[PDB]
Paper text:
Here, we used the LIBRA-seq technology, which identified [name]-[name]-2 specific B cells via DNA-barcoding and subsequently single cell sequenced BCRs, to identify an antibody, SW186, which could neutralize major [name]-[name]-2 variants of concern, including Beta, Delta, and Omicron, as well as [name]-[name]-1. The cryo-EM structure of SW186 bound to the receptor-binding domain (RBD) of the viral spike protein showed that SW186 interacted with an epitope of the RBD that is not at the interface of its binding to the ACE2 receptor but highly conserved among [name] coronaviruses. Administration of SW186 in mice after they were infected with [name]-[name]-2 Alpha, Beta, or Delta variants reduced the viral loads in the lung. These results demonstrated that SW186 neutralizes diverse [name] coronaviruses by binding to a conserved RBD epitope, which could serve as a target for further antibody development.
With local refinement, we obtained the cryo-EM structure of the SW186 Fab bound to RBD-subdomain 1 (SD1) of the spike protein at overall 3.4Å resolution, which allowed us to reveal the detailed binding interface. Strikingly, SW186 recognized a region of the RBD located outside the RBM, which mediates binding to the receptor ACE2. The interface between the SW186 antibody and RBD could be divided into three parts, each with its distinct features. First, SW186 interacted with N343-linked glycan on RBD via both heavy and light chains. Due to the flexibility of the polysaccharide chain, only three sugar molecules were modeled. These sugars formed extensive hydrogen bonds with R98 and D109 of the heavy chain and Y49 and H55 of the light chain. Secondly, the SW186 heavy chain CDR3 (HCDR3) loop partially inserted into a ‘minor groove’ on the side of RBD, where I101, A102, T103, and V104 were mainly surrounded by the backbone of the RBD polypeptide chain. Because these interactions were mainly contributed by the polypeptide backbone rather than the side chains of the RBD minor groove, the binding of SW186 could be less affected by mutations in the RBD.
Residue numbers in the entry:
A (entry chain L): 2 to 110
B (entry chain H): 1 to 123
C (entry chain C): 333 to 474, 480 to 590
Write the structure that this text describes.
Amino acid sequence: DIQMTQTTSSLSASLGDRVTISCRASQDISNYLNWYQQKPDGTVKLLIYYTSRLHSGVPSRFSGSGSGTDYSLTISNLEQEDIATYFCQQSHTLPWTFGGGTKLEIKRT
Amino acid sequence: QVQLQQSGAELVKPGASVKISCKASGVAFSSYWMNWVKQRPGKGLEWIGQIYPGDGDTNYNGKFKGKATLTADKSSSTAYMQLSSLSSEDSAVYFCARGFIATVEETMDYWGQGTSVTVSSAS
Amino acid sequence: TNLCPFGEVFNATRFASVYAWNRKRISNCVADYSVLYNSASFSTFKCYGVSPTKLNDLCFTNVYADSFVIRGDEVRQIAPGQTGKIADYNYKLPDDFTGCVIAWNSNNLDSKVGGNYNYLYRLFRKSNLKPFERDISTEIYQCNGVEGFNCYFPLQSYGFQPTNGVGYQPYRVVVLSFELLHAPATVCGPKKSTNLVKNKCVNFNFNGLTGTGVLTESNKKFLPFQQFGRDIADTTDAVRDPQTLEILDITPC
Ligand SMILES: *[C@@H]1O[C@H](CO[C@@H]2O[C@@H](C)[C@@H](O)[C@@H](O)[C@@H]2O)[C@@H](O[C@@H]2O[C@H](CO)[C@@H](O)[C@H](O)[C@H]2NC(C)=O)[C@H](O)[C@H]1NC(C)=O
């Protein structure tokens, strides 16, 4: 099965700053990647599909990019409710796999 | 509104079998894949399996093959998941999602609230 | 003002087999096909009767979409005037075919590790089929029952494994067909209409019919279905405004 890896397990950022979350795949998957966001309470919803298409109802401050075996999600301006866990999931081969997930924090001790 | 509602938390003795129902409202439930996903706490998401209610087509992950059984209910529009030979590691949160097609790929757009299942023998 | 879906045509979780190609009719919509240039990055997107760019300026009377799945290297069969199993036994296009063909790779969606079995195709057939003809009957062609010497089952399923190399991966194909400018228009893009000006030399575009002249009131009484007026010279004399129903004569400047 395709091995899905997120380099940064967790990261801390301030409000309104651009935040980039990477996602590296073992095998080329074209652009067959989906970004999901899970709230701390456990609610999860789709965020980006096909690495660039913004899902319905999702604020435009989110964006996606990448190709080959490396992709990245970018938050143009981080906002309070954006604090969640982001997963990148492939769709190239039937045994779909999800990334390790990245959690965002505020710059503090 | 497109809503995927699941049952409550389950307490299961080890070695038993447990049924989880995911009911879809506001969706053509019989025309889209139902993908079941497992999440252990602090660990990444694991794609358990997927069913097609239209004709019963199923695709199972290699790790969870045989362990979990997926069935469809067209009348009530509900996907049933049966777990057998439960052990302590199976304690996790299970999600049901809809496999929409973006004409190039399949994406899990709508997700359920998630069912917490814990396997133990405590009172 | 209506937006015809293009969802259940393209955004479909399970296309039909080639021998049972799904047929859909589209009518009464603002067919903003502008998504179809790049919303999916199709491997093949070729148009015969009209360039894809100009399609936003043409109004149709009927639109038919054919959706199915075929073997990779067999995509070239879909073009008109071709031969082979796909193009002769379960799907054929007319020589004068208009509308156009979209095809994209769908290895991830359709292929199964153990070999997909939902997708079938007709390998044996008594004779070639006329354009836009669908045959579903499953009797045995050259014999009783289902099997025997020369008594072969007509339908066989592609072994769509993911490991199959390019040219064997399943390809999803959608073919559009539409007539051009003979009936009251039913399907076309926005081409946002402006105010109508009378008694002045202007260019005009009514339901795709383009021209230049002076528009005047006319007393001719067309039938409810009648749209265009013609002379012995076969030119366009009078046309009926699509928005509001009145007849206007056209005079060359
Ligand atoms: C194929 O579908 C997409 C719809 O994107 C999502 O599809 C489902 C998962 C649905 O549940 C919603 O979450 C999304 O809408 C179409 O692309 C978008 O369609 C919506 C229509 O609601 C439209 O508002 C957007 O502008 C479209 N584009 C993007 C980038 O979001 C797409 O058009 C469909 N295919 C065809 C051929 O129409």
